[PDB]
Amino acid sequence: KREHEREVIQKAIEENNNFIKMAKEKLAQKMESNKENREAHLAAMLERLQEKDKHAEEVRKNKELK
């Protein structure tokens, strides 16, 4: 009977810990995924703008050519 008593309470301990663990990991995954995503978006908007800058340089070179 005493062992089972020690088993129950250790089970409840391990239950709580496991929850805290899973919680911590999940939050860490979602923070990094979001962070990557957001930076990607920003990096693509910047690259589009840079490609528009190059087109303007080329338009300026086309006029100079004539």
């Binding site: 009977k1 008593e5 088993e7 129950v8 309470i9 250790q10 089970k11 409840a12 301990i13 239950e15």
Partner: protein
């Protein structure tokens, strides 16, 4: 033959506190522990529940997972009489979870309590065994109480274990999960108690509401019937007489089979200046409406029965009444147990009554009580309702299943012999 009293949880601590007050009065002990009784009878067996500046101290250990209940007792009239070191409580509380008491938050304090018990048991010249008070349907006394019983049994496997267990009732309920706690407690007791006085918080109400005509009985009301019943059963132990009952002999004579150690208390006069007649006391004593368990004796059969009449009265007339009852009600008495009923008379009457009668019966009808609890458990357990509060502590449905089953077996056993 000292008796180590032990009270756990709110209910357990409240009823136990009155019990001490009552028996202190009868034994002429005031709150300070000093004695002023006019008769030596009072001091003749006072050591059964007291230890002696020529002051008697109750041999009681108070146990709770929250200070509140124990602090009230300390503030109570006899709060002084209780030994301060015997006060033993924590701060977590048991949130009404057997688990929280029998597993999680009790395993701590239990050791502390076992130490006081050990100290009381050492001083005791001949330890008769242990007396416990608790509410089977709560958290500290339901769960932690049964845990202390198990611990106690391991340390003192040669001592009698007796519990005044307060069966929970829908009429007087605190939480939906009270059936669960009761079923677990029931199975603990089935195995680790030699004697269990089932005091249904239901009946008490009824009595109060109906008979005593109290529309809104409070817990004090019920407790008042409880203290009286307590003094009754404990009379033969407290006061000297022809039958110096003891826990072991009490078990030897009323328990035909171990599992069947659950008794229906009964008291009369259910409170008055008109002392009842010996016939009156005897008809009320066996009256259903005077039993503290909410079971009909007529629906079952008395394995064994024991009566006590306190107060000045005709011993012969007493014996005549008892004989009449048995003869008129022969069908309600098991034939296989010859002479299954016995009576005893004490000269000192209960406090404020010219004479009273206390009834202790091992009736197969007691199964009604366990059937009620089992149905409740079944209702919720079929849908696993509220079980997360226990699974969170580390318990497992299987354990609920087992306890449910055992209580059903016990119900079956009472019926078998009934028929």
């Amino acid at each position: 033959r000292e008796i180590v009293h032990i009270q756990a949880g709110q209910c357990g601590n409240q009823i136990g506190a009155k019990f001490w007050e009552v028996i202190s009065d009868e034994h002429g002990i005031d709150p300070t522990g000093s004695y002023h009784g006019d008769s030596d009878l009072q001091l003749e067996r006072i050591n059964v529940y007291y230890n002696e500046g020529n002051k008697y101290v109750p041999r009681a250990i108070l146990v709770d997972l929250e200070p509140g209940t124990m602090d009230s007792v300390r503030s109570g009239p006899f709060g002084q009489i209780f030994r301060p070191d015997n006060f033993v409580f924590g701060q977590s509380g048991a949130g009404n979870n057997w688990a929280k008491g029998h597993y999680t938050e009790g395993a701590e304090l239990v050791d502390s309590v076992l130490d006081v018990v050990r100290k009381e048991s050492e001083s005791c010249d001949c330890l008769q065994g242990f007396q416990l008070t608790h509410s089977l349907g709560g958290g500290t006394g339901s769960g932690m109480g049964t845990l202390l019983i198990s611990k106690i049994r391991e340390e003192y496997p040669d001592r009698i274990m007796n519990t005044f267990s307060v069966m929970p009732s829908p009429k007087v309920s605190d939480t939906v999960v009270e059936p669960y706690n009761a079923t677990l407690s029931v199975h603990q007791l089935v195995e680790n108690t030699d004697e269990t006085y089932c005091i249904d918080n239901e009946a008490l109400y009824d009595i109060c509401f109906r008979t005593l005509k109290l529309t809104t009985p409070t817990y004090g009301d019920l407790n008042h019937l409880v203290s009286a019943t307590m003094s009754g059963v404990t009379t033969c132990l407290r006061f000297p007489g022809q039958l110096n009952a003891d826990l072991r002999k009490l078990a030897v004579n009323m328990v035909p089979f171990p599992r069947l150690h659950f008794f229906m208390p009964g008291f009369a006069p259910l409170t008055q200046y008109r002392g009842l007649t010996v016939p009156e006391l005897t008809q009320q004593m066996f009256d259903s409406k005077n039993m503290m368990a909410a079971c009909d004796p007529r629906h079952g059969r008395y394995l064994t029965v024991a009566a006590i009449f306190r107060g000045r009265m005709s011993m012969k007339e007493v014996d005549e009444q008892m004989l009449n009852v048995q003869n008129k009600n022969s069908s309600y008495f098991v034939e296989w147990i010859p002479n299954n009923v016995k009576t005893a008379v004490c000269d000192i009457p209960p406090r404020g009554l010219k004479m009273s009668a206390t009834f202790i019966g091992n009736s197969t009808a007691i199964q009604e009580l366990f059937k009620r609890i089992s149905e409740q458990f079944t209702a919720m357990f079929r849908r696993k309702a509220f079980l997360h509060w226990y699974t969170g502590e580390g318990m497992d449905e299987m354990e609920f299943t087992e306890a449910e089953s055992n209580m059903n077996d016990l119900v079956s056993e009472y019926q078998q012999y009934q028929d």
